[PDB]
Amino acid sequence: GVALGATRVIYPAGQKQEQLAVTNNDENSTYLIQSWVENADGVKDGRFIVTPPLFAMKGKKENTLRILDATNNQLPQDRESLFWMNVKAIPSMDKSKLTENTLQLAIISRIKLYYRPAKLALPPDQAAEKLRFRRSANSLTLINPTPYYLTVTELNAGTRVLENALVPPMGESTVKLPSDAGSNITYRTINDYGALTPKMTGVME
Amino acid sequence: AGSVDQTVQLGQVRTASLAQEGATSSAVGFNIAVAFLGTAIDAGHTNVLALQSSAAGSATNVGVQILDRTGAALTLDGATFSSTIPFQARYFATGAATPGAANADATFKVQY
Amino acid sequence: GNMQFQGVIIAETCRIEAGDKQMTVNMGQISSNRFHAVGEDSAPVPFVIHLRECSTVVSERVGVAFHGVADGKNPDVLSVGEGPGIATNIGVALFDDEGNLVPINRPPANWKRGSTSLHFIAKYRATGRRVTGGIANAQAWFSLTYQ
């Protein structure tokens, strides 16, 4: 099958292009690889170009997607902007099941593209600790004062585990809070490298 | 003899390439009777450099090896010696490697 | 001299394989007379999606969904096409390991974690009054959205 060499791309502002690996590991299969960029609402967006936008991979082979900056420097310079990278893997002719009725699948892999401005003040490792929480009778709001998108996970309220949340820079995000939810909050985050960050005590706003 | 200090780039390596003890990255040549000295990743792997830790989170279960012309991984006590002289470097996995920065430190004197 | 080795180890996405080669789930042959009422389903055809060579941190958190052209009479099931020799009034319907409908074209969903294989079931569903036989092929994209 086909896989990508990252769960996220950090695009440093001012750089011409960034690379993203694509691999197929099956010598006896051939994939078509289509790639495009969408904005945070999932709409196809042209401020980032992917080349080659369409190509073939025959057998065991590693290829390189190039992600080019086409924003013309129109994005905010004080906060990450969120985009989505889409890589569709289209299989080929399984001539074995020709006489048959078939459900034919293709794979699309969607990972976050973060446009990270140049002279941000707070280093990225220090972002996760700055998360704050606001609590209501049946909802919990996460407050992110940093310029970085925070991907919050292992969110716990007492014994009960909550939805993950994607907290925008200098913004908020809310998740549902069951009745049997406890008082103390812990969370983790997923950092630039795709790893889990250390469990942290949630701090009330 | 000219380039006393130099940085050898090992690349960007995905965790599934270093998923179990013994796993190795794509070696990377570099050159410059040679003993190497560094911090062992642990007491079972004296031939593997420990990674320097990062505030952003360093990788785990993986370190850096150095190999001479014989293709064998050199011991890193500053006493084991290897027989311009080329080498190569690579990652070595001691467990299931986790994501993060993976930089490593070493020194070397020379002996005749 | 002083040596400095630089590099970075990064999490990859899941390498996706199916129980069937080339992601081809082979439905049966279509016996138009087995449908007595809209909504009835044919036999269950299981299919598995494997999440290989990725960290458990990545695979536990991925959100998935099925995209494709819906049957013009039932937005939840995959259309089977239209035209000469093409079956009418059936679509392809997707279910989870427990046999509960997974409607197509919905937001990404997280599942119970666990293991690293997603188990589904495909079924023909009657979408109209008079099923007629023919070739009944469906297509869908299976999208994985990574945290």
Curated annotation (Swiss-Prot), chain A:
<keyword id="KW-0574">Periplasm</keyword>
<dbReference type="GO" id="GO:0044183">
    <property type="term" value="F:protein folding chaperone"/>
</dbReference>
<keyword id="KW-1029">Fimbrium biogenesis</keyword>
<dbReference type="InterPro" id="IPR016148">
    <property type="entry name" value="Pili_assmbl_chaperone_C"/>
</dbReference>
<dbReference type="GO" id="GO:0061077">
    <property type="term" value="P:chaperone-mediated protein folding"/>
</dbReference>
<keyword id="KW-0393">Immunoglobulin domain</keyword>
<dbReference type="InterPro" id="IPR016147">
    <property type="entry name" value="Pili_assmbl_chaperone_N"/>
</dbReference>
<dbReference type="InterPro" id="IPR001829">
    <property type="entry name" value="Pili_assmbl_chaperone_bac"/>
</dbReference>
<dbReference type="InterPro" id="IPR018046">
    <property type="entry name" value="Pili_assmbl_chaperone_CS"/>
</dbReference>
<dbReference type="GO" id="GO:0030288">
    <property type="term" value="C:outer membrane-bounded periplasmic space"/>
</dbReference>
<dbReference type="Pfam" id="PF00345">
    <property type="entry name" value="PapD_N"/>
</dbReference>
<dbReference type="InterPro" id="IPR036316">
    <property type="entry name" value="Pili_assmbl_chap_C_dom_sf"/>
</dbReference>
<dbReference type="InterPro" id="IPR008962">
    <property type="entry name" value="PapD-like_sf"/>
</dbReference>
<comment type="similarity">
    <text>Belongs to the periplasmic pilus chaperone family.</text>
</comment>
<dbReference type="Pfam" id="PF02753">
    <property type="entry name" value="PapD_C"/>
</dbReference>
Curated annotation (Swiss-Prot), chain B:
<keyword id="KW-0281">Fimbrium</keyword>
<dbReference type="GO" id="GO:0043709">
    <property type="term" value="P:cell adhesion involved in single-species biofilm formation"/>
</dbReference>
<comment type="similarity">
    <text>Belongs to the fimbrial protein family.</text>
</comment>
<comment type="function">
    <text>Fimbriae (also called pili), polar filaments radiating from the surface of the bacterium to a length of 0.5-1.5 micrometers and numbering 100-300 per cell, enable bacteria to colonize the epithelium of specific host organs.</text>
</comment>
<dbReference type="GO" id="GO:0009289">
    <property type="term" value="C:pilus"/>
</dbReference>
<keyword id="KW-1015">Disulfide bond</keyword>
<dbReference type="GO" id="GO:0007155">
    <property type="term" value="P:cell adhesion"/>
</dbReference>
<keyword id="KW-0732">Signal</keyword>
<dbReference type="GO" id="GO:0042802">
    <property type="term" value="F:identical protein binding"/>
</dbReference>
<protein>
    <recommendedName>
        <fullName>Type-1 fimbrial protein, A chain</fullName>
    </recommendedName>
</protein>
Curated annotation (Swiss-Prot), chain C:
<dbReference type="GO" id="GO:0009297">
    <property type="term" value="P:pilus assembly"/>
</dbReference>
<feature type="disulfide bond">
    <location>
        <begin position="14"/>
        <end position="54"/>
    </location>
</feature>
<dbReference type="GO" id="GO:0009289">
    <property type="term" value="C:pilus"/>
</dbReference>
<keyword id="KW-0281">Fimbrium</keyword>
<protein>
    <recommendedName>
        <fullName>Fimbrin-like protein FimI</fullName>
    </recommendedName>
</protein>
<keyword id="KW-0732">Signal</keyword>
<dbReference type="GO" id="GO:0043709">
    <property type="term" value="P:cell adhesion involved in single-species biofilm formation"/>
</dbReference>
<keyword id="KW-1015">Disulfide bond</keyword>
<comment type="similarity">
    <text>Belongs to the fimbrial protein family.</text>
</comment>
